[PDB]
């Protein structure tokens, strides 16, 4: 909402004459009480010869691209200059605005006599943009006949000492979408007397002798008031006075004819939208009714709307007159030849208009005010104000007929219910002791009825404030008018917190631990790539494909939510690689979305009570599973090139080591077992178990997934379900034996298919407590041990808890361990050593 300071000032001045304030101050008072000033535009300044001219002669210049006009312009004192202009929106006899040589326009433009298109041009004719008066539309500014004689000082006629405040009103404050509302706000801020510009002293009631038009209203439509008055015999060629075309222009509304302009004006003055129907184009009774399935209307702009059974309409016997509250229709639109006007002054249902306007994408000036509730008490006053003004400009007469449907049965008092609040409740909530009676005076200033009753106020808010419904609403009023800056800064006593939880600590430690080892965290997108699972070659019944789908993504091809974090990780890996950062290791810690059924939503639960424990569990069960995952990808080098040697390319072993890092950070023990699972390589893919629960996978990616996905050769990956890794809080108590140790190295031959950790476990099982440490050294294959066998050399460190281990004692433990590997994985002793 834009409006200009002069008008805002005029309306405040009625009740506090001589009121006036710098724009800077006004901007600050508006912010201080709740209104966002997006922008302050003082009307761009002019200097020198910028005067009204009259076009006296137009010569269409031929031979060029555009149609060009060499115009004789009467500039005062019988002085006629020729001027070149490209526009076409003006005729001989029109008052235009000319910047003559020596003038300076907004933006630092000096005008000079310039030869152009074959003739001399002594300046130019201005657009309202070039003057910084209004928005740039096509062509120049033309003034209504009689606004000014030629020669008149442009700056004075245009009123360029004005300033246009551009405000972003909040939806609770619809009443401020008008000069009426803001005026009242300013009067409240500055403790000024306020004359309501919709009061009867300012709009005397017009007579009421009979109904102005037949009207049926289906009341379940939500209409709360519907008033009509006609004006007959208006000059259709009359145009609106300069003052009125101007304030529309400053407010953002282009003028068209008095019928339309007067409604737009009174809409801005009082906040009550209005509309003008060509009465002679109405066939029969006016009907308010819902639309039917498949019904259609063409609105003013001649565009066909597909209607919805919740859109309220105005119809007649012939067709549709208005999508109520949003936009009139063509069928009754005022046109060039309209002599007799019927003026609509209605109050629609806020939620109805909101629904309808969002569906049709018609955020009209009318719609946005009805969304935020219009003061129903002023419809006839706005209708009367708007009728007199029309007759006054375009010279018709205002019939004393009047229709005024106010519901069934009629509402005669539009005041909300009274709200009941303790006199000092504002003081509590602010933490400030306001001077006595503050709270009552401020609630009176906004227009409420305040009655006292000991320590308990009874407050009936006024009809234009439907947002004032509980004491919290009343508090914000008092607090914003006194200023929020007067509220002190008092730290509250907060209780002994428990600090972070175990899982919160575990995510931090997983992050430190991976980051130190060279991984760079990304923020994964939850929106999957298109067809990623077709790229991975996942079977159609692969659980990962069962995705919760978003219904309005910012990319129509990417509407599924991630059931796995590798897609987003792999996407970031691709980005780093395409920018030359080929040696990368990324990781992420975020939830996935795995749904358990088809999207079942639970219906509304009353908000006046808290939901039951059961209603919570049902709400929780309605949502998909959303476990925390950790995941990571690696590509290129893992150790970089240097003086130490050429570096080490990423290998699947590095993804297993990522598992062990997360497990060490989580203080749990994991086992890795071979597995086939896409998108991993089948011969290099491990499944991760904590105890006997699967927590995820790790390994090198499938070479065919790599290839279809444009991924780097050899990329490795890892994903673990954190929710599947249990809490652990060890209280270790390590037995630290000081007695000497015996070191022996044993080599075992086993079938190639046997995992190294199996042989290690068997050796540990057989050797018992004496074995302090076991570690795999060598892994050797060759013909002489058998084409399908392999030789594992383990390094064993034995140590007794109470004695110096003999070296027979050790070989006892060795022999015992060798026997265990024989019985469990069929090991054969190769040999041993020290």
């Amino acid at each position: 909402m834009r409006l200009p300071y002069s008008w805002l000032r005029e309306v405040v001045a009625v009740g506090a004459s001589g009121w006036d304030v710098t724009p800077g101050e006004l901007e600050q008072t508006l912010l201080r009480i709740g209104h966002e000033v997006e922008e302050v535009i003082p009307l761009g300044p002019v200097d020198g010869p910028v005067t009204v001219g009259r076009v006296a002669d137009i010569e269409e210049l031929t031979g060029y691209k555009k149609p060009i006009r060499a115009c004789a312009v009467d500039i005062g004192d019988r002085q006629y200059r020729e001027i070149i202009c490209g526009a076409t929106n003006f005729a001989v006899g029109d008052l235009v605005v000319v910047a003559l040589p020596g003038a300076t326009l907004p933006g630092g433009f000096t005008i000079s006599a310039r030869k152009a298109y074959g003739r001399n041009s002594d300046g130019m004719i201005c657009s309202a943009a070039e003057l910084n008066l209004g928005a740039d539309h096509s062509g120049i500014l033309v003034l209504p006949p009689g606004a000014a004689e030629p020669g008149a000082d442009g700056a004075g006629v245009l009123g360029l000492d004005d300033v246009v405040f551009h405000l972003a009103i909040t939806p609770d404050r619809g009443y401020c979408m008008s000069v009426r509302g803001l005026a009242r706000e300013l009067a409240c801020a500055y403790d000024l007397d306020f004359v309501d510009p919709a009061s009867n002293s300012r709009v005397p009631p017009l007579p009421i002798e009979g109904p102005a038009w037949p009207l049926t209203v289906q009341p379940e439509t939500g209409v709360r008031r519907f008033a009509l008055r006609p004006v007959i015999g208006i000059d259709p060629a009359a145009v609106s006075p300069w003052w009125l075309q101007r304030r529309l222009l400053l407010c953002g509304i282009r003028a068209t004819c008095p019928a339309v302009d007067v409604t737009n004006y009174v809409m801005l003055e009082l906040g009550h939208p209005m509309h003008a129907h060509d009465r002679n184009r109405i066939s029969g009774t006016l009907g308010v009714r819902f639309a039917r399935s498949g019904e259609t209307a063409v609105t003013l702009d001649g565009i066909e709307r597909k209607l919805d059974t919740a859109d309220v309409l105005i119809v007649d016997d012939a067709a549709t007159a208005a999508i109520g509250g949003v936009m009139g229709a063509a069928s009754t639109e005022v046109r060039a030849d309209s002599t007799d006007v019927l003026l609509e002054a209605a109050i629609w249902d806020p939620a109805a208009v909101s629904r309808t306007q969002r569906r049709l994408h018609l955020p009209s000036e009318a719609a946005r005010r009805y969304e935020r509730t219009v003061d129903p008490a002023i419809s006839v006053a706005a209708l009367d104000r708007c009728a007199r003004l029309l007759a006054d400009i375009a010279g018709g007469e205002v019939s004393p007929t009047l229709t005024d449907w106010r519901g069934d049965p009629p509402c005669d008092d539009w005041s909300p219910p009274p709200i009941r609040m303790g006199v000092d409740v504002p003081d509590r909530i602010a933490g400030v002791a306001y001077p006595q009676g503050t709270t009552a005076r401020r609630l009176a200033q906004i227009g409420a009825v305040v009655t006292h009753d000991g320590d308990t106020l009874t407050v009936t808010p006024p009809s234009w404030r439907p947002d004032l419904r509980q004491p919290a609403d009343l508090v914000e009023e008092v607090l914003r008018l006194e200023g929020l800056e007067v509220i002190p800064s008092v730290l509250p006593p907060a209780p002994a917190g428990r600090g972070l939880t175990a899982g919160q600590q575990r995510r931090r430690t997983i992050g430190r631990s991976l980051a130190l080892s060279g991984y760079v965290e990304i923020l994964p997108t939850p929106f999957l790539p298109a067809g990623v699972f077709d790229l991975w070659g996942l079977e159609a019944d692969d659980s990962r494909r069962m995705t919760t789908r978003v219904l309005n993504p910012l990319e129509a091809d990417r509407p599924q939510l991630a059931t796995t974090l590798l897609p987003a990780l792999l996407e970031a890996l691709v980005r780093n690689v395409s920018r030359g950062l080929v040696d990368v290791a990324l990781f992420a810690i975020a939830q996935v979305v795995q749904p358990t059924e088809q999207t079942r939503g639970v219906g509304l639960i009353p908000v006046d009570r808290r939901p039951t424990d059961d209603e919570i569990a049902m709400l929780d069960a309605s949502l998909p599973r959303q476990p925390q995952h950790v995941a990571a990808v690696l590509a290129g080098l893992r150790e970089p090139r240097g003086p130490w040697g050429p570096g080490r390319p990423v290998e699947a072993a590095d993804a297993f080591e990522a598992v062990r890092i997360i497990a060490r950070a989580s203080r749990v023990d994991v086992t890795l077992r071979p597995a086939q699972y896409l998108p991993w390589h089948p011969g290099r893919c491990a499944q991760v178990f904590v105890g006997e629960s699967s927590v995820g996978h790790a390994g090198q990616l499938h070479p065919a997934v790599i290839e279809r996905s444009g991924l780097p050769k050899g990329t490795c990956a890892v994903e673990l379900n954190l929710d599947a890794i249990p809490c652990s809080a060890p209280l270790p108590a390590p037995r630290v034996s000081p007695y000497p140790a015996v070191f022996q190295d044993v080599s075992l031959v086993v079938a190639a298919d046997i995992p190294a950790q199996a042989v290690a476990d068997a050796v540990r099982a057989g050797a018992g407590d004496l074995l302090e440490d076991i570690a795999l050294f060598d892994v050797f294959t060759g013909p002489q041990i058998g084409e399908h066998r392999k030789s594992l050399t383990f390094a064993l460190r034995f140590r007794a808890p109470d004695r110096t281990l003999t070296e027979d004692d050790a070989s006892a433990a060795r022999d015992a361990a060798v026997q265990s590997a024989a019985e469990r994985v069929g090991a054969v002793l190769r040999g041993w050593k020290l």
Binding site: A494, A496, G497, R498, G499, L500, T509, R512, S513, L516, S517, A652, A653, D654, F656, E657, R660, R664, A665, R667, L672, R673, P674, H681, P682, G683, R684, C685, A686, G699, P703, P730, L731, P732, A733, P734, V736, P755, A756, Q757, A758, A775, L776, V779
Partner: protein
Amino acid sequence: DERLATLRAERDAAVLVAEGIDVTLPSTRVPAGARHPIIMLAEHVADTFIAMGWELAEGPEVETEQFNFDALNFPADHPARGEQDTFYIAPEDSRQLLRTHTSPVQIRTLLARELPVYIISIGRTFRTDELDATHTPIFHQVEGLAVDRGLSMAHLRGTLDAFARAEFGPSARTRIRPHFFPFTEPSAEVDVWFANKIGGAAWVEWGGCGMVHPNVLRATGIDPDLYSGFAFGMGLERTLQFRNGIPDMRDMVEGDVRFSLPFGVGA
């Protein structure tokens, strides 16, 4: 061509098994280390009190006798001030020593900051006990001090019980039994109910506590008629021993890698 790509498939798929690998091989080429367990105990204690609005203060280990004793209301010929119980800096009567508790850090803190003051001081302290399985001459201690208007023993127990719950479980409580410390008055000893184990939930002596002595407040310019205070101190090696079941303190201080690694990284 019905079966040109069906064996062209199983050709490619047994290439993938030809490049199989023993996923159970060790992968850790940068063995994990370990922050020391006492430091992690100190870490977890610190965070417990930070989470309650407290702050940590530090100070020198070699410390003026002014701040170790006199400001803490030890008489001029108190037994602890002899070469039996306290490490002294040469030469004789140089009023310099290795601090025997972290309380001086709290005096320093009470001198430097505006009241109210809720301060933890966790650091290395020094007594002359011979190193055996239940004593160390170089030990780490955690001491608190809270000075404010209207503080009472009930607040002392409140903080004690909160502290206990974080270090031992929601099943843990404290009891206080009168004792004597020059720093405090009244003074009690704090036993803790360690339910989670010990082989069978029993009370254990944890530390001492008490209301801060008026004389400590004068020695720091604080009016005892306006502010009161409480304090407590628990020894960390003591706490690690008895919670974890570590029969031999020597393991905590001898720096054997085998003692520390099983506790994990501490990251």
